[PDB]
Ligand binder design. Structure first.
Ligand SMILES: Nc1nc2c(ncn2[C@@H]2O[C@H](COP(=O)(O)OP(=O)(O)O)[C@@H](O)[C@H]2O)c(=O)[nH]1
Ligand SMILES: [Mg+2]
Length: 179
């Protein structure tokens, strides 16, 4: 039917440098913010839970993948959607994240979502250009999504529905004129 897919299980790789918040992001997928985390439920570097996509229950696997040092080149990029994470409070974070995209995903068919982590902290701009938003406009990616794991409030679930939807229907992801 329209809006349905044979896929029951979707794979997202959460790809980013050490310290950008990948492990906390996986915990937030399971409904746990900073401190409220709980390690002994799922394997390290993995988080699985159900996500609704157009009324249908899907399983989304988040798979944590580092990019520090040699990992920036020694990357198995295969996944249904790549979540490219950079530290929104770190001036130097985005450039490394953008380089990973260019070398592994830029001219592929895998949907990519840039995520600006630690949105609760004071923002950290880079000295050179371009901005993360300008980079995504040029390479025709979605606008980078800010995310935060802190606060006493429950973590938002919107970005995980977005990742699951991109994974389920990879041909309807885009940047678009007119809107
Ligand atoms: N303020 C804040 N700190 C965060 C957030 N996410 C992660 N951190 C902290 O940043 C550090 C690295 O996070 P971690 O999840 O281990 O990153 P990883 O190395 O990419 O897996 C830890 O001290 C976290 O508590 C966030 O949204 N806000
Ligand atoms: Mg980690």
């Amino acid at each position: 039917m329209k809006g349905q897919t044979q896929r029951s299980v979707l794979l997202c790789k959460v790809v980013g440098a050490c310290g950008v918040g990948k492990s906390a992001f996986l915990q937030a997928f399971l409904g746990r913010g900073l401190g409220h985390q709980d390690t002994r439920e799922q394997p390290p570097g993995y988080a699985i839970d159900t996500v609704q996509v157009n009324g249908q229950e899907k399983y989304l696997i988040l798979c944590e993948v580092g990019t520090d040092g040699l990992l920036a080149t020694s990357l198995d990029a295969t996944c249904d959607v790549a979540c490219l994470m950079f530290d929104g409070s770190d001036p130097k974070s985005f450039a490394h994240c953008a380089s990973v995209y260019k070398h592994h995903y830029m001219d592929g068919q895998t949907p990519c979502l840039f995520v600006s982590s630690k949105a609760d902290l004071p923002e950290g701009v880079a000295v050179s250009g371009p901005s993360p938003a300008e980079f995504c406009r040029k390479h025709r990616l979605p606008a980078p999504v800010p995310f935060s794991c802190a606060g006493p409030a429950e973590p938002s679930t919107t970005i995980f529905t977005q990742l699951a939807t991109m994974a389920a229907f990879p041909h309807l992801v885009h940047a678009l004129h007119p809107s």
